[PDB]
Amino acid sequence: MLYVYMDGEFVPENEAKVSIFDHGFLYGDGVFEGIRAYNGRVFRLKEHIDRLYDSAKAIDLEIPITKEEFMEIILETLRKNNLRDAYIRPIVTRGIGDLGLDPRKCQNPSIIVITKPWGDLYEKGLTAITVAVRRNSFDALPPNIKSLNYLNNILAKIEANAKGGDEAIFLDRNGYVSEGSGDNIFVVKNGAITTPPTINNLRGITREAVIEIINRLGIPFKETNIGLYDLYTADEVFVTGTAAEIAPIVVIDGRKIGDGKPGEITRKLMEEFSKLTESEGVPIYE
Amino acid sequence: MLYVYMDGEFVPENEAKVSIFDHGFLYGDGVFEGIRAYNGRVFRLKEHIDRLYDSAKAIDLEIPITKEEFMEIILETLRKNNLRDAYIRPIVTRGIGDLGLDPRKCQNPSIIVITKPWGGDLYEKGLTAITVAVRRNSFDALPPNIKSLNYLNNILAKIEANAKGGDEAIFLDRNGYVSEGSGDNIFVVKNGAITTPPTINNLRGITREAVIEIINRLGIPFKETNIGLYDLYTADEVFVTGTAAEIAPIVVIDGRKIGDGKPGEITRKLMEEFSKLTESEGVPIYE
Amino acid sequence: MLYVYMDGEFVPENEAKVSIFDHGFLYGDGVFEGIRAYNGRVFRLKEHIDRLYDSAKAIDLEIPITKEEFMEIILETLRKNNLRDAYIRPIVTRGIGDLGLDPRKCQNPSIIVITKPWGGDLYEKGLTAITVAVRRNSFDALPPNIKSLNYLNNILAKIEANAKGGDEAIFLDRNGYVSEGSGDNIFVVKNGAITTPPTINNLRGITREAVIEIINRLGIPFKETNIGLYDLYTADEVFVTGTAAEIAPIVVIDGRKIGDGKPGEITRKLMEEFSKLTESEGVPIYE
Amino acid sequence: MLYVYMDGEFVPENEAKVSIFDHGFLYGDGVFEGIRAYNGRVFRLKEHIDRLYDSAKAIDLEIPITKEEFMEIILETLRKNNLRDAYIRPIVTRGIGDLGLDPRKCQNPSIIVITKPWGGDLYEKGLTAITVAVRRNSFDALPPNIKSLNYLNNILAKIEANAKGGDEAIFLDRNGYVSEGSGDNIFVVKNGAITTPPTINNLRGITREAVIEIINRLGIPFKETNIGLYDLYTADEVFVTGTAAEIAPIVVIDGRKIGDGKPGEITRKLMEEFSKLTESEGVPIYE
Amino acid sequence: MLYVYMDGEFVPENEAKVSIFDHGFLYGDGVFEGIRAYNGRVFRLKEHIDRLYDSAKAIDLEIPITKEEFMEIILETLRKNNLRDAYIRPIVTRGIGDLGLDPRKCQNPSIIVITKPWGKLYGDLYEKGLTAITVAVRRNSFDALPPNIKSLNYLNNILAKIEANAKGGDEAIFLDRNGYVSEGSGDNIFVVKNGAITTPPTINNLRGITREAVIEIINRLGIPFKETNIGLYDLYTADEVFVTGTAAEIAPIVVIDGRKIGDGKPGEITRKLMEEFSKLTESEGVPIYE
Amino acid sequence: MLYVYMDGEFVPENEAKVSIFDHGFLYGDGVFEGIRAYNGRVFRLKEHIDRLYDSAKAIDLEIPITKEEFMEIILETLRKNNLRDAYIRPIVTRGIGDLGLDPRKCQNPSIIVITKPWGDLYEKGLTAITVAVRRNSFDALPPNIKSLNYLNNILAKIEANAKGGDEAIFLDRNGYVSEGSGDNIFVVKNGAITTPPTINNLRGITREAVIEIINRLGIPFKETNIGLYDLYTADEVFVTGTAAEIAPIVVIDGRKIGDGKPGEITRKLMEEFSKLTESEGVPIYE
Ligand SMILES: Cc1ncc(COP(=O)(O)O)c(CNc2cccc(C(=O)O)c2)c1O
Ligand SMILES: Cc1ncc(COP(=O)(O)O)c(CNc2cccc(C(=O)O)c2)c1O
Ligand SMILES: Cc1ncc(COP(=O)(O)O)c(CNc2cccc(C(=O)O)c2)c1O
Ligand SMILES: Cc1ncc(COP(=O)(O)O)c(CNc2cccc(C(=O)O)c2)c1O
Ligand SMILES: Cc1ncc(COP(=O)(O)O)c(CNc2cccc(C(=O)O)c2)c1O
Ligand SMILES: [Cl-]
Ligand SMILES: [Cl-]
Ligand SMILES: [Cl-]
Ligand SMILES: [Cl-]
Ligand SMILES: [Cl-]
Ligand SMILES: [Cl-]
Ligand SMILES: [Cl-]
Ligand SMILES: [Cl-]
Ligand SMILES: [Cl-]
């Protein structure tokens, strides 16, 4: 039924498998992206591919095809599955080597493209908890790299699951707010919006699009460090990501945020973002 | 030719593959061990299996078989490949779920056992090391005590070592203390006394534990305490420990000769004692 | 129907009030203790009073009576209320001054002694704990070794625990190491050995000290060393210690069952030994 | 002579007392503000009340009256004492509960309003400051943005300043950056440009906000950015801002003369502009 | 042959010596500057002297002459050696005292001016670009030994240089105590990505005079510019990286930690800034002889 | 009147000068020791020389003579000045090179030996203040290296001078007590003695000798991290170093330590240390 691109061939989902000797599996030595197709268009495809190549460069991995080729493979995979509204997960691995860690002994990076169809939480908003684990440090395992090492994020999610939150919020190694387990975070206070600099989190493509909207609407905006206090006393909080789009956060660590309902600025940004996704993107067909 | 245990079946190496939808692959959401078989015996098998289950507990992953069953599967895999001297890599994954990170959506952890035959001139001369710019993953972020499939921090250090002329990389931690090598624990020898970092910022090495037993048996003064760059540079001897490496002497750090630049007397003594231990101890594969 | 000692007079509870201009109220500028009376004896009275004077010294506050006088006032207050089993809360404040924070403007520290009667289904089943996002007050900012009226750090942790399904909150410190619970010290049991953090990032608990004496008397291997999240999650047993709590088992941390999820054998043994200690030791209230 | 608002009644100063069982006293579990009345007007009353409610939200405390009601109570208290020039200290406490720290056991928060008359030579000459060894309470432990009854960190800094020859203490934060004074925000002037730390490691000062409005109106180059010890020592001018202090010049830091050792031209200009602002703005007390 | 100014006298290089009891030698208790003369002009002389006095103020050292006097001494030293293109190193020491560290026991700070000829024997010395490595040692903290002070305490920088020498880099790059990029062992660092330029704030490094001049050029050219914290990731994934300093001018960095930066050659924006900076040095400065 | 050893010759003090082009002067690129001669004996000469060579190794500086030769030069310098009670300051510099920082360009390290004669505050004790500056980090400029870079120590001393302390006390980059500006620190509480581990400070030779005495006397002793709280609430505090020997600290940050007078354990250790200095050491003459 659904086909996965894997190293030059289309392979059914149930058969899409990688060698256990690939360093992408043994050590999470690889990179990935998350991309959305809306109404036959791929939203910000080029931006995602640029980021995929930056992630690879950061881990000294050479992607064995060009950006143009990678974009064509993504479009082809969507076509092959006849999708118009989808989630796309391109993955590049280090490849098979010996059982040590040396990446120089790895040959043939694998290229994989997964496409899956995409068809109360936003009306009511999400509950969040701040986690005890800090985000992976920008001087240890830089979170700006979207790699197959996502266990830091998973530990945060496990905490949220056990602690009554829909979402986990990280602080960084220096005590500053970082991001959610899988999304960037924005704070609204007295009509002005703040978001952390991207060094301790990930340069979100949704985040970038939302900042463009914010500036277009003339809402006062500042990229600056935020703390627990700013989260708790905010008028509104929301998170941004490819899968989530814009999700309101209405409770943090048992405290109602503002009136406890998705806020007016958040709702306005949600509308504007929907508009953007309906009118922009690389066409899949024709 | 060589068979891998994978979820109840023996599968040839070239066919040993995991679903790309397993969270072990998508997110490195899984745990592993490294174990050695010497002369038909598996060295410290129980200790490694205890640590595998601790790694799983740390990431809230339930291993779907008992420790006894896991040990039998390891022995069976070695038997199936007729090995007497081998490296063993058991792996447990979170399993297949959807494309989000939530582990609650994953069912059926995979159980995998890799066994590869095993049979140094670098040990006569010793290794060169460099200290890396990247710090070790924090014990309050992604605890390095967990032996997980998230090894990119270690790989980044190895990439630095490759580019900077070192056979091995040495990490400092988030607080500026010496941690470990990219894949081994680290020991410093100075004026007849040995120091090693506490295990919080690194990994509770089974080789490290065995070497400490030897050290205490020999009556060499020993202290588990924080060490710094200064202690590395001014050491009489430095060595690293791990399953694959055993005991490897480090004779140059950041361009500085360690002592006389040759593997030291205490290191050599510990290397001999450790060889003896591996030849006389372990769970028998065949008898 | 209970009397409180307040600056030389015995005052009924409903009338026990402090000026809003006391810096102890305006700024939490004061120190306190928590002490238990068991069967007509005050457990470790002298140790608690020594710590009260150390807390005061740390904040440069001069307690205007001697330790001997303070002990007599505590005994008198218990007598006046005819208590044999009680919780005692001595408090010393900076005193009344102007509306600035300068302690030089404050003249007459207040001395207060509260005694309340004391007469554990959660101890059969054990407590659930969650690790909090807030770190403990730093030992280079507002040292937690000072038992002061500044307890908002502890309250924020408790608020997190209340919202996040834990009976107790566990803090990490400014450097990523485990510190303590919101109101108790923490111990980890693993393979028959016990570890607890050094006291610098937490509080030199009198219960903690008594439990360490028991541990050493029983010959259980014991080490004071830094502990991390990993050590909590993979422990055989965890327990917390304090005056009010005594020894409380922790059986779930951050959704993970600790060992078998029931109070452990070593914990239960220490609980018994500690009960024995409280029944046979202490400064007698009567005669 | 002077009356304090306390839970619905006016009470003379000498009788204004709080139960020792209020958590505001036992644990400093409460919030406060500092507000000035100038010539029958309350300067930035609404801003202070907004911040009071934000402080309460941060510690999960529900103030049991509306902001409008709180403002009326403040005006009423000033009227009752016939004040035109005053310092106002509203306080909200967690309330009486049991002797544990759990705020869920507390029922009835207390509402308190203190008003004291107000109405120099240190401002012509400027103040001496010393940087303290204690760091400011961390924004990830006990956020300094909360104006709470936990002021012992500030008091420790003041004690250091008293012992070390400074009129004021200057804090660095947990990451080594300049934070603020023990009771005021800090600004640096260098080559005609002004810098001040971001507010995360200190307090969002209402005076600070008013001074930034003046700075921007005057077109003085201004940047909110991290400052270090070096920037303090080599500044042309330094000043601090707060409700009680207004704008105070700092002319010596750690034994070093700042610029020429006298209040600087930009500081003096800002002092004039700020006086003007206080004379022409505010919520009228009478009529 | 070359004369050094030392406390009021001109002294030949081979005789230019300081008492071993000067605290500047015993403890590195002193301050210095690095200044260039181009075609008979001293580039940004006043800015360098202002920074020298700020360094001294930071270590509570009173320079015993005025800024105007110091500038005249520098010009005089260049004249005495008949230089038109030179490197200038003014130094002020704490002075001679006893063998303890207390600076109160020191009298008479020494004033020293070194001038050495400078000849770019080839233009296009940075045609290929430099290789860099990030070091394990962090930069001296802004709350311990502030790097904004250009003092005689340069051992942190030397340790980084030793690492670079042993690890195959022409230059060392520091991170700071909080994990942020700081600077090179002797130069400020800039990152170019998608036509925009970033550089760290100056708190964890040094307020470079070259850095300041390059920022003026950047703004004049209308290149998007932001002063903000940068991490290892930003270095590795940059289109271009360059470093700035008095001696180096603008030096391209084309490899970091074994990774080619962009195409591995000095980048277009870097080359443009190098041209503009050369122009600036040819047309500005305090005249030595005029 | 007094002669300084400088690169093979004895040179009068007033003429003892180093080239301004030596990197030891330009960049503080060199190492030093502090040693005492008592009654014609040099106390712990070998330990000091071992530490000098360790400092040099730490900065990758090769001392161009052997330890035995260095010891002889020290003895010779003392003899030449006819001293019996003295302070000795050996110094090794990187040497002359060009004006850059690269140590590869420096060829001939200088060897210098300074010897100066040696002969109420200990009866009353010293006042100390804790400084705002942290000690140089063990991951930046390791304080275990006794180098010519002493400006961190000088900044602390400047703070102490301005803030009414005879001595400055440092905390480290992680908030733990480190040492004084020129001495190690010990805390006495309820008959037991604590001192920080040596990683964040310097492996003091006096400190080592005092620990030997402590153990010989059977006083309970522990090497562990100490905080501000432990300083303020101590029964006794003292500092140790070559010049200071054992100095009691009786006031810290305006707080009287115990009764404000040198304590019983401190006084006992001062006596025992005097005894040690009278009966041990390498003889200068014969
Ligand atoms: C980070 C780390 N530290 C220490 C050890 C040593 O532990 P044992 O003494 O128990 O083996 C390990 C485990 N050693 C390990 C794991 C994976 C790869 C490699 C390699 O050398 O390439 C080494 C490890 O992965
Ligand atoms: C850590 C992190 N932060 C931010 C984002 C948002 O980036 P974009 O705006 O470019 O998508 C991501 C990406 N979002 C992401 C990726 C993988 C899984 C999940 C999940 O919700 O389970 C979320 C991410 O993984
Ligand atoms: C830590 C702190 N920082 C800044 C300010 C200034 O904020 P406003 O500009 O909003 O006033 C304050 C408030 N100022 C304050 C509060 C309580 C006591 C004292 C005192 O100086 O004794 C001072 C404060 O307590
Ligand atoms: C930073 C530091 N720490 C400890 C000591 C004590 O070490 P020994 O016990 O090995 O001497 C020292 C050495 N003490 C020293 C050196 C130079 C000057 C001054 C001064 O107080 O003016 C003091 C030192 O400089
Ligand atoms: C640490 C540091 N950072 C930046 C600069 C650049 O500042 P100007 O742009 O103002 O020059 C310097 C100064 N550059 C400097 C000083 C001394 C030696 C060396 C060397 O590279 O060998 C370099 C420096 O020493
Ligand atoms: Cl990390
Ligand atoms: Cl900030
Ligand atoms: Cl340590
Ligand atoms: Cl803190
Ligand atoms: Cl530790
Ligand atoms: Cl900054
Ligand atoms: Cl530092
Ligand atoms: Cl930042
Ligand atoms: Cl510790």
Side-chain angles (χ1 to χ4, degrees), chain B residues 53-158:
Chain B
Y53 279 66
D54 281 343
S55 291
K57 166 56 79 173
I59 69 162
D60 195 41
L61 169 65
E62 199 152 323
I63 297 169
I65 64 176
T66 69
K67 291 179 176 183
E68 189 199 306
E69 293 172 313
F70 221 130
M71 283 181 288
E72 209 52 61
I73 286 166
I74 284 157
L75 294 170
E76 257 34 70
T77 307
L78 286 159
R79 281 174 207 140
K80 180 78 185 219
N81 291 300
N82 289 114
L83 296 157
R84 299 184 36 84
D85 298 281
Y87 181 80
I88 310 123
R89 166 85 47 106
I91 298 175
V92 183
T93 71
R94 182 77 65 185
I96 296 155
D98 73 23
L99 285 180
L101 56 104
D102 186 0
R104 288 176 307 186
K105 275 143 170 71
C106 298
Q107 54 211 276
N108 334 292
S110 276
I111 292 168
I112 301 166
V113 184
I114 295 167
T115 59
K116 284 267 201 196
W118 193 280
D121 213 49
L122 265 62
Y123 294 55
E124 269 280 354
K125 66 194 32 172
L127 311 179
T128 62
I130 61 106
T131 55
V132 297
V134 285
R135 297 304 192 237
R136 192 68 175 96
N137 286 335
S138 176
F139 38 86
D140 82 339
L142 179 48
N145 283 184
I146 311 166
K147 202 167 188 96
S148 76
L149 303 177
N150 273 224
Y151 260 56
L152 202 48
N153 177 228
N154 308 78
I155 291 165
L156 288 171
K158 183 63 184 175

Side-chain angles (χ1 to χ4, degrees), chain A residues 134 176 189 230 255-256, chain D residues 54 57-58 140 175 204:
Chain A
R134 297 305 192 237
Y176 308 119
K189 178 67 164 184
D230 303 300
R255 295 157 174 80
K256 255 186 227 162
Chain D
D54 280 344
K57 168 56 81 171
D140 82 339
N175 297 330
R204 295 190 199 155

Side-chain angles (χ1 to χ4, degrees), chain E:
Chain E
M1 207 264 317
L2 289 163
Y3 293 89
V4 173
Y5 180 97
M6 290 206 59
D7 294 312
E9 36 182 51
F10 294 102
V11 170
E13 286 190 330
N14 45 89
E15 266 155 85
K17 290 182 187 197
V18 64
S19 168
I20 62 168
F21 294 93
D22 191 320
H23 282 208
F25 174 71
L26 289 174
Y27 306 120
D29 192 7
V31 298
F32 80 96
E33 274 300 328
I35 322 175
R36 283 282 278 280
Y38 295 89
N39 196 35
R41 280 178 212 102
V42 191
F43 186 63
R44 304 267 159 130
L45 180 58
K46 191 42 165 62
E47 283 83 352
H48 282 280
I49 290 299
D50 283 344
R51 194 174 70 192
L52 186 76
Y53 278 66
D54 280 342
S55 291
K57 166 57 79 174
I59 69 163
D60 196 41
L61 168 65
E62 197 190 322
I63 296 170
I65 65 176
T66 69
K67 291 185 180 175
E68 310 36 70
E69 292 172 310
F70 221 129
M71 283 183 285
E72 207 51 63
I73 287 165
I74 284 156
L75 294 170
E76 260 312 287
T77 307
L78 286 159
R79 280 173 207 140
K80 179 78 189 202
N81 291 300
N82 288 114
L83 296 156
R84 299 192 23 96
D85 294 82
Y87 180 81
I88 309 123
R89 167 86 47 106
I91 299 174
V92 184
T93 71
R94 182 78 65 183
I96 298 155
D98 70 29
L99 284 183
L101 56 104
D102 189 356
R104 289 174 312 187
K105 81 230 317 151
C106 298
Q107 290 145 80
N108 335 130
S110 277
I111 292 169
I112 301 167
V113 185
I114 295 169
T115 59
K116 287 271 201 193
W118 193 285
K120 270 192 79 169
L121 215 86
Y122 317 91
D124 275 56
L125 33 90
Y126 299 131
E127 177 72 317
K128 284 210 131 105
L130 309 179
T131 296
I133 60 108
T134 57
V135 297
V137 286
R138 297 304 191 236
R139 192 69 175 96
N140 286 335
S141 176
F142 39 85
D143 81 341
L145 181 45
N148 284 180
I149 312 166
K150 200 167 190 97
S151 74
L152 304 177
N153 274 225
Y154 260 56
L155 200 48
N156 177 229
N157 308 78
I158 291 166
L159 288 170
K161 184 63 184 176
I162 292 164
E163 285 191 51
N165 290 347
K167 290 172 200 194
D170 302 307
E171 182 49 311
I173 298 167
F174 281 115
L175 306 188
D176 74 9
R177 56 140 296 106
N178 298 329
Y180 308 120
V181 173
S182 163
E183 62 181 337
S185 66
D187 12 72
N188 293 105
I189 187 157
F190 287 76
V191 164
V192 187
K193 177 67 166 186
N194 301 327
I197 301 182
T198 49
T199 196
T202 51
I203 192 180
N204 77 8
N205 55 75
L206 186 111
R207 293 180 203 168
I209 281 141
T210 320
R211 172 191 187 277
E212 200 187 18
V214 175
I215 289 164
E216 289 167 12
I217 299 166
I218 287 161
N219 286 331
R220 199 188 69 224
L221 295 173
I223 302 167
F225 173 72
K226 197 166 186 222
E227 186 187 84
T228 193
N229 283 319
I230 295 175
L232 250 11
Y233 171 90
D234 303 298
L235 294 176
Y236 293 171
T237 63
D239 291 331
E240 322 177 24
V241 177
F242 63 89
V243 298
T244 68
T246 295
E249 305 181 307
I250 298 170
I253 306 300
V254 299
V255 176
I256 303 172
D257 294 339
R259 296 157 171 83
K260 249 56 173 158
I261 301 308
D263 75 326
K265 288 272 163 219
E268 284 162 7
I269 287 163
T270 305
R271 291 207 220 249
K272 182 86 228 275
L273 299 170
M274 297 185 256
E275 294 165 31
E276 295 307 304
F277 186 76
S278 275
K279 284 185 206 182
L280 201 70
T281 57
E282 285 155 15
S283 65
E284 269 182 18
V286 171
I288 301 162
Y289 308 98
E290 277 314 308

Side-chain angles (χ1 to χ4, degrees), chain A residues 27 99-101, chain B residues 32-34 48 51 87 89 136 147 151 154 180-185 203-208 241-244:
Chain A
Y27 306 120
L99 284 177
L101 307 166
Chain B
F32 80 95
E33 274 300 327
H48 282 280
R51 193 175 69 193
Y87 181 80
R89 166 85 47 106
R136 192 68 175 96
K147 202 167 188 96
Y151 260 56
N154 308 78
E180 62 181 337
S182 67
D184 13 72
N185 294 105
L203 186 110
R204 293 156 163 199
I206 280 141
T207 319
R208 171 191 186 277
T241 68
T243 294

Side-chain angles (χ1 to χ4, degrees), chain F residues 44-74:
Chain F
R44 304 266 158 127
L45 179 57
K46 190 41 165 60
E47 284 81 355
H48 283 279
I49 290 300
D50 283 343
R51 193 175 69 193
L52 185 77
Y53 278 66
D54 280 344
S55 291
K57 170 56 80 166
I59 70 163
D60 196 38
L61 169 65
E62 198 179 32
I63 296 168
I65 65 177
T66 70
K67 291 186 181 175
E68 326 7 282
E69 293 171 316
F70 221 129
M71 283 182 286
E72 208 52 62
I73 286 165
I74 284 156

Side-chain angles (χ1 to χ4, degrees), chain F residues 27-41:
Chain F
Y27 307 120
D29 192 6
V31 297
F32 80 96
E33 274 299 329
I35 321 175
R36 283 281 279 281
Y38 294 91
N39 200 38
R41 281 177 190 249

Side-chain angles (χ1 to χ4, degrees), chain C residues 198 200 226, chain F residues 176 225:
Chain C
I200 191 178
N226 281 320
Chain F
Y176 307 119
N225 282 320

